[PDB]
């Protein structure tokens, strides 16, 4: 986005920094070298937030360029992002795939899981290598959420952010959903979105089984 | 050791073209290299190119337009005549519609069609199509 309306905001920067989203791994990919800002003395590569925002807007433009919202497929094989892709698909009309990705979904036209999308969106190239490889048989362009150490073999609009932190993954799936809805005619762009980023977050069953009972105790007393 | 600077330039350009690089740097520059690249430029197979001038043999950065298939060389600079130029054409060029054989004649470095037009033969340098 080259315009002033499509520019970074201080609250968005705060959300990014709170969830992380700018600390990558200790390894760097030569194709992500131009997204990396600088690696600290700790050895962690720090990404460029303006660049990752530009990539996010580019992916949002690619998504909103498709007429049928059901024709874009959002996937994630990792539980740190399964909830995010499910909420994203519910919000934007996409078709979700969470967890196991059966081989031949895009290639074998026999099994009931078979589908033909026009755009694939991937939480992690390393985790979702199989759907990325299958996209090469069916003329399927892909967007991925890449980290500093992830391959870019079959990726087009790789957002160079993070694929390790649950907070970061959920936050940026929320960012993509909000941006595609805002560029569509559903949000006014002035007031903040009513959907909370923590909704897209994934949490561990250890705390799924305790937070609600603690809160119920707080309510009863 | 390096004995054919033109051959090295042409192989470097061929490799960069096959890799899809937008630019490539030929380290040793020569007048024959400049003329060969000029005829390729005039036919449109490459874009602009730059001659970096150090006080040694200069360097060249050429911009590849992505429309080059092969730009090989004919290292033994054979004596070609107007009577046997067409056999070279058949042996080297992919088709009669396109492709060029570059040869140095006493009228300058040119392609085979221009050499035939001004009725002169020379020494074959290389080809590109």
């Amino acid at each position: 986005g080259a315009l002033d309306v499509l520019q970074m905001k201080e609250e968005d920067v705060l959300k990014f920094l709170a969830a992380g989203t700018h600390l990558g791994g200790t390894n760097l990919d030569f194709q992500m070298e131009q997204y990396i800002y600088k690696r600290k003395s700790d050895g962690i590569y720090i990404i460029n937030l303006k660049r990752t925002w530009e990539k996010l807007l580019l992916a949002a433009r690619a998504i909103v360029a498709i007429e049928n919202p059901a024709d874009v497929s959002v996937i994630s094989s990792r539980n740190t992002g399964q909830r995010a892709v499910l909420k994203f698909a519910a919000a934007t009309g996409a078709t979700p795939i969470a967890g196991r990705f059966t081989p031949g979904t895009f290639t074998n036209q026999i099994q009931a899981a078979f589908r033909e999308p026009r755009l694939l969106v991937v939480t992690d190239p390393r985790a979702d290598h199989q759907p990325l490889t299958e996209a090469s048989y069916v003329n399927l362009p892909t967007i991925a959420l890449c980290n500093t150490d992830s391959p870019l073999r079959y990726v087009d609009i790789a957002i160079p952010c993070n694929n390790k932190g649950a907070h970061s993954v959920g936050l940026m799936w929320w960012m993509l959903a909000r941006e595609v809805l805002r560029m569509r005619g559903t949000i006014s762009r002035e007031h903040p979105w009513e959907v909370m980023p923590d909704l897209y977050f994934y949490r561990d069953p250890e705390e799924i089984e305790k937070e609600e009972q603690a809160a119920a105790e707080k309510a009863v007393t | 050791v390096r004995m054919n600077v033109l051959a090295d330039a042409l192989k470097s350009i061929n490799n960069a073209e096959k890799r899809g690089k937008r630019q490539v740097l030929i380290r040793p520059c020569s007048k024959v290299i400049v003329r060969f690249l000029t005829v390729m430029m005039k036919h449109g197979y490459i874009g602009e190119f730059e001659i970096i001038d150090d006080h040694r043999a200069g360097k060249i950065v050429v911009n590849l337009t992505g429309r080059l298939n092969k730009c090989g060389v004919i290292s033994p600079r054979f004596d070609v005549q107007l009577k046997d130029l067409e056999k070279w054409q058949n042996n080297l060029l992919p088709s009669r519609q396109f492709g060029f054989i570059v040869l140095t004649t006493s009228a300058g470095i040119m392609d085979h069609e221009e050499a035939r037009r001004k009725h002169t033969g020379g020494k074959i340098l290389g080809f590109f199509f």
């Binding site: 986005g1 194709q31 580019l58 433009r61 690619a62 360029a65 079959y154 569509r184 | 899809g20």
Partner: protein, 83 residues
């Protein structure tokens, strides 16, 4: 194609990769063609039309489709200059 009488004797003209200027073959299923939806000046809303790029299979297999699409967006102004 386009013999000397002027008619185009060719049943189709194949697409070319906007990144590396290669013919995209009919059986290049790895290759992609993608639209990017631009927005209007003030409100940043989708204005209907888009801008199209094509990437061939070899280019988008060696791993540089990201860089290619980013450069094309910079050239067309979708990605700002100060990127």
């Amino acid at each position: 194609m386009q013999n000397d009488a002027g008619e185009f004797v060719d049943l189709y003209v194949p697409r070319k990769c906007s990144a590396s200027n290669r013919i995209i073959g009919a059986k290049d299923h790895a290759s992609i063609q993608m639209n990017v939806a631009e927005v209007d000046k003030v409100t940043g809303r989708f204005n209907g039309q888009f801008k199209t790029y094509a990437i061939c299979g070899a280019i988008r297999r060696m791993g540089e489709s990201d860089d290619s699409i980013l450069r094309l967006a910079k050239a067309d102004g979708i990605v700002s200059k100060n990127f």
